[PDB]
Amino acid sequence: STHFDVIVVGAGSMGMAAGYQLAKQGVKTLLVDAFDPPHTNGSHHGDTRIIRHAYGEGREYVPLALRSQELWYELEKETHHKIFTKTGVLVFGPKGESAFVAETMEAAKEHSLTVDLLEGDEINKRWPGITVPENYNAIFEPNSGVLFSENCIRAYRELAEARGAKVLTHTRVEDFDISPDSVKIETANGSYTADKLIVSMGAWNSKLLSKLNLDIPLQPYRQVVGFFESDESKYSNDIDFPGFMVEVPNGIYYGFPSFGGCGLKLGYHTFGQKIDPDTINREFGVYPEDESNLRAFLEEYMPGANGELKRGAVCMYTKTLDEHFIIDLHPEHSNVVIAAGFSGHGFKFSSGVGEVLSQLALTGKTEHDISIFSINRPALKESLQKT
Template sequence: MKDRVDVAVVGLGAMGSAVLYQLAKAGASVVGIDRFAPPHALGSSHGETRITRQAVGEGRDYVPFVLDAHRIWRELEAATGDSLFEACGALVMAPGHGETSHHGKPDFVRRSIEAAQAFAIPHEILDGAEVARRFPQFLGLGGDEKAYYEPGGGYVRPERCIAAQLRRAAELGAEIRTGSAATAIERDGSGVVVRTADRSIHADRAVVAAGAWTVPLLGAPFDRLLTVNRQVLHWYALDDTSAYRADAPVFIWMHGTTDTDYLYGFPPMPGEAQIKVATEQYATATTADALDRIVSPAESAQMYRRHVEGRFAGTTPRVAQAAACLYTVTPDRGFIIDRHPEHDRIHVVSACSGHGFKHSAGIGKAVAEWVATGASAIDLAPFSLARFR
């Protein structure tokens, strides 16, 4: 154990594992700290799969992150032999008329198309009739739907991605301390000291990527900016998988006007006869430690009735599994990547707001550059705290 390191990274989930890996890769002296033993099922980065898409309807400022992330996943696959990223294609679909919203952004399909055009991302624009012809697993389409299809999209495996980055970070010299919760971060001369129950870690800088545990650790002003919401994932059994061909994409399907009138999901994994789907809720807040991790049969039944029934070939209401996770959400559902307003040697990387994992590897690289040199190749200004003042 070193007496002092260049950077202490607090939280080793999606963002923290990526930052730790990139700092270690750059030759920095780093230590990573987590109260659990990532990858784990207690935060926001579990559940086997996460959608990735390059044309980001949440805003063009995000696109450089995910473009970098796709490259980094492939680099990690080559270095580790792990399978991390499956480019099965991504479909974003909405009604052909009327208003829609996703992650607080209106007309999300149009925004995705505009992002693809701006960054020359290969894509197709489809209507409902073409979606039904090419992807027969989608049922009940009226024919006039508007859809964005991205062949380079797909899914990443979050647990494997986190494990691969932590393993590579350790191989590159990073110290990793799990089962060790940070209890405070304080000034230490020109640097910081991160305190745990059994150790004080002195560092020139700290990166806090604690997700749903950010507010208990840092307090103001994050206590008024971050809300934790419980989200639920459902896997429904299929009694017929014939409609799910090899080119079956991941999907985001808006079927109403509000942010909760939609679902997202994944085709069956190889050798499985089930699909994973979920929606989102922002009405009920919780905390990381108070989260109800048990998904009731009534919740899965309601999800099936409202969002699944009649929309997917072969789907049954039989629940193969279910899980709860956490979103940590800002008022505008964007990210925070900035210095602590009262301590410029504490860098805060939170919150994902429900759409962060696909960006995480790219954010890790950008944050490592920023921490090491004071600037990054990707503009981080759109993710600053200043927008909330």
């Protein structure tokens, strides 16, 4: 019975940000989510998320990283929820043996980002609690840091709803019916129509995009993290222990300083179980790798934080073949915007993506350069399920 200007399916990290940007402009928006964001069934829980500017995944992400940072500061001033803490972000690895470290330094140089460069014992000297080999080098970004992801989504939601946005919770979208001049969604709670559609279902994009005649390789991964009882005199944000993302022989790890004594949080990025969001086991510890992969890191590089496991969380990445995002219009429907495959590193950009999605939905174009996120790029292996 009711139409909308724009309908956002999946009101999570990207969708809720888009909802806020749309509502902010008086655009009558309906956001539909299978749950009640923020929640623990998607990819945004775990309390915290790292934001980096000097981007090791590729220096082309910097502009979006910087715009997103400015938007996070703006959100901080608009809500009572805590949004960002400037812990700084440390990146280290074996000298000359880390592509991630190399690209980070290059990204820094190329965009004139403020960073500190140090090696070996200088790393251990500066940050009691971190022990790396003499052959290790590092780049520290003082001004990037940590975002409180659940708070971000919560704030964007409260703000969007206050502006008129409608949020239909616990309602899973089951199908799509797209037309030349309108879009329609089917749910158990009723059907809804609008002029434009934004699709941002996270891990579920790998299962439901086929409903839009899109055949794109997207693989969901089970990715856990653990909070460990740590030596507060070394790992507390209060004593300036930084957030970090590093690359050692067996891969890439990321962590957060202890906030208010919650313990240092650590996650292993490189490995994760291939899963389906509908059958994934969300209990931490069911796989021996969950806790063992983390402690193996701590015992070697941050021994003082290898205490009791205080809490474990299970979350998901949705990877593309090239690990770059998908942000573009549906190849056959200019009134349909797709946001998918953030491959484990998209939260920091959610504020900026919200803006991009808003622009694409309203005008079919964006001021941002998102060519590398094209849904038609060859490295993606995208195609229609039947042309």
